[PDB]
Design a protein around this ligand. Structure first.
Ligand SMILES: O=C(NCCCNc1nc(Nc2cccc(N3CCCC3=O)c2)ncc1C1CC1)C1CCC1
Ligand SMILES: O=C(NCCCNc1nc(Nc2cccc(N3CCCC3=O)c2)ncc1C1CC1)C1CCC1
Lengths: 629, 629
């Protein structure tokens, strides 16, 4: 209950403070008449700078400017007493991209869906600024607002641009600006890398302090297209990389497209840098693509193939080969219990409905190594007995982010196993289908044969050289009957292999790994909830800047409680989730080999049935079609 | 920052108050040394009542008593100054069953999974009290605590029992106690009905006020086994029902089991009431059953069949018939793209993995009416301009509960449509399989025929009455060839029906209804989030008992905002979700009829192939096996 400023139609408390900037501040405020929430932007220190004439039109420009990706400026009013210039802005309750990246769940990067939303809204908003001719240069997660749309999905809105006339962020600065639309793409690139990785691209050991002199020497090199550079020791060598880290939660399909984009917008040289049209063209090319989910049983890996709606199954096979290394003519698709056949010129529009939980399976003929999920093994940071509020808050974010990652990995392990179980069941049903068809071909052959041998035996029965002619056939057809007999038996051996408890049964898989009923992920989430609660409390303890004797000891206790929670989670993750996954993968390799062996043998047997089929067509007309007047 | 009481090892604020009871109060408190949270029970008004000797042992009993379904009493201590008796109890941060039922999402009953958890924990806890001989009688959602388990699932713990010595809830009172373990089962029954329905079983028009005299006349009748009775007008007739209301979110399978249980524990007569062993036996019988998900394509209805692990497919078919009214020999199962065959003596243990999203489909031969989902059409309560805080809070709960229900129904409509789409695709693939097999039988027949007619034509060719004998066969086999020819053609007509754009294609279904990409449920949830926020704020406004001039107008605004949110949701629910569902159901009926027609015709054609197959076995030996020395 303290004093707050106010304007003829609006009012707000100074206690309610949204963001702090150099020129102005932003407060959570309400309209006087309707009581609706608005972001009130109050200029701090105005006097020398302010123009009645110029800034009038400057604000009159941003007013009528309207878009989905840009925060709406509704009006320009004066504070009641001080007559300060006050902007009435659209309020965004969810905060900004920074607020999103501060969540430990996004410590190692945004989810794929959410990252694409960011890429979409940012590009669209930045492009709308291009169409007006206004430059930003200051694009940072802090000035990228976030709201909840009608459809529940996040919508990102740009803010605070054009201060480059009347008047970039420190780690978002371009090397030369650190010392032209290139500077825009740089802040964009660092932002995009931050959203995908959960970390800045270029990090010195000390940090963005006085010792940030190293940062410039880091940015200066600009080697290759490398998208990141980090020194892991005080004043030492720099580790460069032109690829996303392992902890990244984006798909391989998305990374292959994203890496070049970040590579060309992140360098000092104006020679190798892009332009907004080129950038827009490449980014929009990524956003226009639909996603087909494909699980490779061979390697036990999930894949997101990014395809345009108008592309064909030809380019589809190529992309699948690019990820799974399976040759286009070796890819055998399976969808919902049955194999799937695609015409080489069939469009991507009419592809079957796909989800991560229901992908197009891919089994091959050529043997393949089971890779499984590749993730970065991350362990808990050491916890100090030190009482530092800032240190406790930062550590709380880090250690929770580690558990969030492990929880993420665990959720994927279960998905891989569950898909591995579905694909195996469909495959054995498909192999059973193949056995039945081969049996049908054998029944035809044996009928044709049994009919050719009887007709010839009836020929010698009723009605010198002739008995010699018919005897070659007797010897020939007998050899075919014996071979057909053996084939008939070894096929029943394959049926004995396909029978329940046949040594190719899928009984093992349910046994080997983890199941949704184990509720492993939910157990991690429980501990993650306790940790995230203690985390947000440590944030509020940081905000106070001090604590009472009571809250001091409660803080010291929950800090040790935060540790025991994390250790409990990681122990459960490694002992229960990982181990059972490993064993499932090991027993998956063996079944695959046995499965590949069986299919090869069945193929040979099927080929042999075709051979005896085409060899009895050359005899059933041989003596039965004898000629005379 | 005010005064709070404390004990040698514990301390607490009076501002932090968990629950208020007659004898005692409960505060949120912390341990002095470790700082861990505990529920502190402080006796109010003790003096005349208290026994040093008797109550010592009374508390010494509850101490060592330990269970998963009973709140743990850790110690008995004295307050520092007043020397009041203080119990140190296990703290339950989630609140109680009342707190759970106060959530608008549970306005029309708990979710099925959650209700079963309640039934489980309550029964187990009540039974553990039975084993010790302690009676409760006061069992109410208020004294049934809830905590979050390690596996994320709720765990319910009983509390506050045995006060029937030293010293039930008003609407939870037994008719005679309103004026013996029967009283226990009554409070249980009213509680269980409350959890499943979201409302009390017996409701007068005025309420539980002075005019609650009517309540006794309601309870007094005890007609039949009826589980509920409500008068909809002031001092008028009572509407009785022996079945759950339509708004209930429990499955038909669960209701069939639950209704009798609530029927036998809810009446005045000691003659027709159960006992704890009978109650335990029936409730545990329900809890021991596993659940098989089955979707009936014919009626477009989802089903939860409750089966013991040791039961067989015989009893399974019976239960399916009990719900879907499809005769046991007419039930054709489909699972993951392929039809499923079950041995009549196959146990329930080895049934395929089932979920609501992946059930065993059931298609029939006999025509059936498409019922679809049956739900209660609920509309928004009228909103008063009155400023009453209590009235605003109650109305806020009601109107949000209505939207929660509509959101629930909408989520199910999408599930039904999505399952309807999967079942159709699998069915047409299965019909294609049948077409292919019929084709195979025809190829055999035509080969046998073409081989019998040629051999006979070669007989007349080479080497009075004889030419007459062979001519009957010539005329006979010709008739079979013509009929086989016609069959061969109308089968290709069926193939033309099964071809894409064949008039039995499933193109329509995706077109007719709603899809997950429409994000209808997420849109409702957004509005539901705004409503539930204004709801909880109105609760806090109620708690204050007054508001400042500012908060008064903000309250008045958000009340009108609560209405526009709800109307927006219900409009979207009826116009967008319902309508598109209706049309999908209407176009589902037509496809079903066409599908049933096609299968009948294919059957006749398949039967005709068997006939010409068995009619050529009586001829191919007729003259070719002629006898002579
Ligand atoms: O435009 C700037 N800063 C961007 C951030 C501060 N400005 C704004 N803040 C929110 N809303 C907001 C900002 C932060 C947080 C939250 N949160 C987080 C939790 C709950 C809540 O209300 C909500 N909206 C909107 C805006 C902009 C004014 C249209 C410059 C720095 C000072 C000027
Ligand atoms: O035993 C009784 N009442 C039952 C309710 C009050 N007693 C208790 N309350 C919580 N915890 C509790 C009770 C209510 C609410 C919340 N909530 C809801 C939101 C956040 C929170 O802390 C937490 N635990 C445990 C207990 C019992 C003491 C072991 C009798 C009535 C007075 C004695």
């Amino acid at each position: 209950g303290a004093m707050g400023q106010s304007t003829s139609n609006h009012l707000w408390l100074l206690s309610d403070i949204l963001g702090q900037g150099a020129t102005a501040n932003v407060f959570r405020g309400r309209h006087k008449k309707t009581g609706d929430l608005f972001a009130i932007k109050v200029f701090n220190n105005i006097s020398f700078l302010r123009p009645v004439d110029v800034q009038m039109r400057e604000f009159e420009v941003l007013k009528k400017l309207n878009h989905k990706n840009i925060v709406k400026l509704f009006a320009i009013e004066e504070e009641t007493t001080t007559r300060h210039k006050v902007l009435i802005m659209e309020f965004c309750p969810c905060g900004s991209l920074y607020t999103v990246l501060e969540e430990p769940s996004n410590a190692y990067g945004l989810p794929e869906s959410e990252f694409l939303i960011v890429l979409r809204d940012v590009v669209g908003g930045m492009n709308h600024l291009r169409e007006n001719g206004i430059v930003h240069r200051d694009i940072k997660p802090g000035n990228i607002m976030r709201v909840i749309g009608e459809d529940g999905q996040s919508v990102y809105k740009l803010t605070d641009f054009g201060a480059a006339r009347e008047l970039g962020t420190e780690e978002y600065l371009h090397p030369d600006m650190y010392e032209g639309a290139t500077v825009d793409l740089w802040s964009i690139g660092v932002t995009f890398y931050h959203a995908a990785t959960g970390s800045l691209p270029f990090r010195p050991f000390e940090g963005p302090r006085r010792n940030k002199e190293v940062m410039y020497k880091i940015i200066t090199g600009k080697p290759s297209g490398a998208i990141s550079g980090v020194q892991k020791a005080e004043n030492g060598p720099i580790d460069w990389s032109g690829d996303m880290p392992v902890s990244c939660s984006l798909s391989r399909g998305l990374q292959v497209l994203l890496t070049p984009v970040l590579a060309n917008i992140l360098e000092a040289d104006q020679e190798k840098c892009w332009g907004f049209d080129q950038f827009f063209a490449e980014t929009s090319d990524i956003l226009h693509r639909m996603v087909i989910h494909v699980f490779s049983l061979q390697q036990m890996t999930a894949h997101k193939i990014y395809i345009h709606s108008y592309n064909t199954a030809t380019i589809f096979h190529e992309l699948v080969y690019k990820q799974t290394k399976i040759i286009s003519s070796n890819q055998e698709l399976i969808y919902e219990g049955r194999r799937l056949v695609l015409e080489p010129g069939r469009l991507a529009q009419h592809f079957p409905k796909t989800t991560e939980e229901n992908p197009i399976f891919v089994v091959s003929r050529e043997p393949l190594n089971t890779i499984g999920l590749i993730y970065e093994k991350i362990s808990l940071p050491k916890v100090h007995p030190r009482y530092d509020l800032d240190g406790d808050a930062s550590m709380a974010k880090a250690i929770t982010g580690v558990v969030c990652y492990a929880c993420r990995i665990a959720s994927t392990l279960l998905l891989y196993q569950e898909l591995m179980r579905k694909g195996i069941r469909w495959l054995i049903e498909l192999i059973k289908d193949d056995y039945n068809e081969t049996v049908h071909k054998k029944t035809e052959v044996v009928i044709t044969l049994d009919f050719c041998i009887r007709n010839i035996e009836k020929t010698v029965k009723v009605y010198a050289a002739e008995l010699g002619e018919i005897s070659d056939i007797h010897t020939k057809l007998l050899r075919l009957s014996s071979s057909q007999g053996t084939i008939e038996t070894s096929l029943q051996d394959i049926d004995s292999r396909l029978s329940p408890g046949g040594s190719l049964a899928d009984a093992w898989a349910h046994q080997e790994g983890t199941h949704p009923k184990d509720r492993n992920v939910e157990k991690l989430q429980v501990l993650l909830n306790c940790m995230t609660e203690i985390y947000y409390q440590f944030k509020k303890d940081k905000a106070e800047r001090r604590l009472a004797y009571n809250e001091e000891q409660i803080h010291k206790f929950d800090k040790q409680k935060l540790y025991y929670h994390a250790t409990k989670a990681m122990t459960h993750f490694t002992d229960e989730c990982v181990k059972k996954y490993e064993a499932f993968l090991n027993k998956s390799e063996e079944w695959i080999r046995k499965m590949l062996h069986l299919r090869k043998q069945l193929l040979s047997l099927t080929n042999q049935c075709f051979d005896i089929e085409e060899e009895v067509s050359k005899y059933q007309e041989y003596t039965n079609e004898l000629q005379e007047t």
